[PDB]
Structure 1
Amino acid sequence: MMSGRPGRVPLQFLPNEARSLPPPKLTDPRLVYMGFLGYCSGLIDNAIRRRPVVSAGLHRQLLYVTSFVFFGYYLLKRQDYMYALRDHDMFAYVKSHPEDFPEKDKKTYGEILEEFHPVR
């Protein structure tokens, strides 16, 4: 779908047109879940390595957390930019092809005859 999109330069995680969108907030629920994933990784690291799972290596658990949040922020930016691109192309295509997307003639339920099915 999006592979051969025009202007799509290779090996570029965020293109420069993404800087027009709002960056994700720092307390973004998805970013906080990223940090939680890092914290779980640190706890499981203590468990497998046979260390006290909660209080051993606070620097290591902390680094797990911050690296997970660091990757999550950029992942969120790229995801949001891809969805913005999707909506951008969809609206452009609906605009360029009005015949494929007609203006449906709206009618009220007072003139629309819906069939009644009794429950009995």
Structure 2
Amino acid sequence: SAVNDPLELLTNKGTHEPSFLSPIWNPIACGVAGVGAAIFINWGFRKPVFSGIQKHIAFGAIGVGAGAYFDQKRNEYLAKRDAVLRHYIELHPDDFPVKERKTYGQVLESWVPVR
């Protein structure tokens, strides 16, 4: 629409579809991190890197669990953040007034003649 209402801009509509890697990147990233961290420990102790896979599974499992938990909390923090902005906009409609959208017909800015 021709209007610039800041509250409209913030408000979601559900049109956006989050990417495929979005709901899995933090779990999978931590899971790989846990395993890789376990790989150092054996290497640091000059043990066969895949010896004692128990520790790999634990670190991988612990990584996934922690990743999912913190990812769950992340969205609440983001959801709350926009909620704050939307509420603050509503309280001060004067400081965020609706502005009209100019088009290039009604403006004359400079250009840079390279020559």
Structure 2 Cα separation of the partners of residues 65 and 49 of structure 1: 19
Deviations 1:4-60 (A, max 9, x none): xxxxxxxxxxxxxxxxxxxxx9x611211011110111101111122111x201111
One of 42, 46, 51 as aligned partner of 2:42: 46
Pairing 1:81–2:76 present: yes
Count of paired positions = 95
CA distance in 1, matches of 2:107, 2:87: 33
**Residue in structure 2 matched with residue 92 of structure 1 by the alignment:** 87
| Distance in 2 of aligned mates of 1:68 and 1:116 | 54
Quote the residue 2:31 is aligned against: 35
Q: Deviations over 1:34-90 (max 9, x none)?
A: 11110111101111122111x201111111100111111111111111111111101
TM-score (norm 2): 0.76
In the other structure, the counterpart of 2:64 is: 69
Q: Quick one: percent identity of the two aligned structures?
A: 31
Alignment partners' CA distance in 1, 2:44 and 2:60: 18
Q: What's the counterpart of residue 60 of structure 1?
A: 55
Pair 1:119 & 2:114 matched: yes
**RMSD across aligned positions (CA):** 1.8
Residue 96 of structure 2 corresponds to residue 106 of structure 1: no
Structure 2 counterpart SS, 1:113: coil
Name whichever structure is richer in helix by fraction.
Answer: 2
With normalisation by structure 1, the TM-score equals 0.73
Q: Which gives a bigger RCO, structure 1 or 2 (Cα 8 Å, sep 6+)?
A: 2
Structure 1 partner of 2:3:
none
Distance 1:98 1:56 in 2: 64
Q: Which runs of structure 1 show a deviation greater than 4 angstroms over 4 or more consecutive aligned residues?
A: none
Please list every run of 5 or more consecutive structure 1 residues that lacks an aligned counterpart in the other structure.
1-24
